[PDB]
Design a protein around this ligand. Structure first.
Ligand SMILES: *CCC(=O)Nc1ccc(Cn2nc(-c3cc4cc(C)cc(OC)c4s3)c3c(N)ncnc32)cc1
Length: 291
C-alpha cells in the first residue's frame, strides 16, 4: 500500500505461515498464524500468533483505522496482561498486524466452559482473574489509554491461563454507536458503559473503572449476562433511579462492595485501577485455594 517502512516491527512475509480464521471478522479478519523467527536471536523457532487484516470490501477509512490501532500499540508498549504487538507486514502487499495469541478464547467463554453442571475454578482463581485484568488496565491507564469497552468478551486467555486485555487501541467513533446493536453473543454493550458515558458520552479512566465493575460481576457470575431481558430503553431508566446489579451468589461481601464502589454515581469517588490492583492483591493472598 502507501505504508511507510518501520524496521522496528517489520517482518518478512515469508516468515508468516497463515492459518485458519479465528472467529469471524467483524471489522477486519483475524486469523491464526505461525511466525518463523520473531526472536532476532532465535530464528529457527515458530511462534503461534494472531494476525489482523482487512476484508476484501474494505474502505480507505478501514485501512487508516487499522493503521491507527497498530501505531497506538507501538506507543503503549508491552505488558504481561495485555495482548501485545509482536510485529507487522506493511511492505509489498496487504497490511498484516501481528499480535500475541490466546488459545483459550475470551474471558466469558473461559468462565462459562468451567461452570459446574474441564476443571472448575477455585475462589482464588476467580479473584486472581480480577487481579490480572486490573493490572492490565492499570498499565493501560498509566499510558494514558482509555479502553471504552472493557468487558469479559474483550479479555482473552492464553494457554497458561493468563488474562490479556484486547482491543485497547481499537479506533472507534463514539458518535456513531448503535446502542441497539448487539454483540454476536446477543448482549448489549451499553450495559458496560458508565452513566456519564451512556448519557453525556464522556469517556475517562473512571468510566473504564465502571466497566471493570461489570467485568467483576461477569467473573463471579462465571460469565453471566448483565441485566438479562433488559432492553436499552429500560436500562436508561434503571441508571436514572440509581439501580445496581444484585450481588452474585458465591461472592464475598468485600468483592461486591468493590463492584459497588466501581459503580459510584460520582466518577471522582470511584477507585483507581492502582487501588483495585492493591486491593485484589491483598484479597488473593487471603482467598482460600480450596474454594
Ligand atoms: C466482533 C466479532 C469478532 O471480531 N469476534 C472475534 C474475532 C476474533 C477473535 C479471535 N481473536 N482476536 C484476537 C485479537 C486480540 C487482539 C487484541 C489486541 C489488543 C489487538 C488485536 O489486533 C490488533 C487483537 S486480535 C485474538 C488473539 N489475540 N488471540 C486469539 N484469538 C484472537 C475472537 C472474536
Amino acid at each position: 500500500y502507501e505504508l511507510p517502512e518501520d524496521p522496528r516491527w517489520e517482518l518478512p512475509r515469508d516468515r508468516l505461515v497463515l492459518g485458519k480464521p479465528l472467529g469471524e471478522g467483524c471489522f477486519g479478519q483475524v486469523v491464526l498464524a505461525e511466525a518463523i523467527g520473531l526472536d532476532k536471536d532465535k530464528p529457527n523457532r515458530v511462534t503461534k500468533v494472531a494476525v489482523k487484516m482487512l476484508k476484501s470490501d474494505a474502505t480507505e477509512k478501514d485501512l487508516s483505522d487499522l493503521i491507527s490501532e497498530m501505531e497506538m500499540m507501538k506507543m503503549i508498549g508491552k505488558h504481561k496482561n495485555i495482548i501485545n504487538l509482536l510485529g507487522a507486514c506493511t511492505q509489498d502487499g496487504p497490511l498484516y498486524v501481528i499480535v500475541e495469541y490466546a488459545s483459550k478464547g475470551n474471558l466469558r467463554e473461559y468462565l462459562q466452559a468451567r461452570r459446574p453442571p474441564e476443571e472448575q475454578l477455585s475462589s482464588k482463581d476467580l479473584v486472581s482473574c480480577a487481579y490480572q485484568v486490573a493490572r492490565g488496565m492499570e498499565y493501560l491507564a498509566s499510558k494514558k489509554c482509555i479502553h471504552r469497552d472493557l468487558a469479559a468478551r474483550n479479555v482473552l486467555v492464553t494457554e497458561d491461563n493468563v488474562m490479556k486485555i484486547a482491543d485497547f487501541g481499537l479506533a472507534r467513533d463514539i458518535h456513531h454507536i448503535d446502542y441497539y446493536k448487539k454483540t454476536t453473543n446477543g448482549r448489549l454493550p451499553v450495559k458496560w458503559m458508565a452513566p456519564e458515558a451512556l448519557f453525556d458520552r464522556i469517556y475517562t479512566h473512571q468510566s473504564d473503572v465502571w466497566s471493570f465493575g461489570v467485568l467483576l460481576w461477569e467473573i463471579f457470575t462465571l460469565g453471566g449476562s448483565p441485566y438479562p431481558g433488559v432492553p436499552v430503553e429500560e436500562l436508561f431508566k434503571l441508571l436514572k433511579e440509581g439501580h445496581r446489579m444484585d450481588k452474585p451468589s458465591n461472592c464475598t461481601n468485600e468483592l461486591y462492595m468493590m463492584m459497588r464502589d466501581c459503580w459510584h454515581a460520582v466518577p471522582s469517588q470511584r477507585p483507581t485501577f492502582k487501588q483495585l490492583v492493591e486491593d485484589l492483591d491483598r484479597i488473593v493472598a487471603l482467598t482460600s485455594n480450596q474454594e
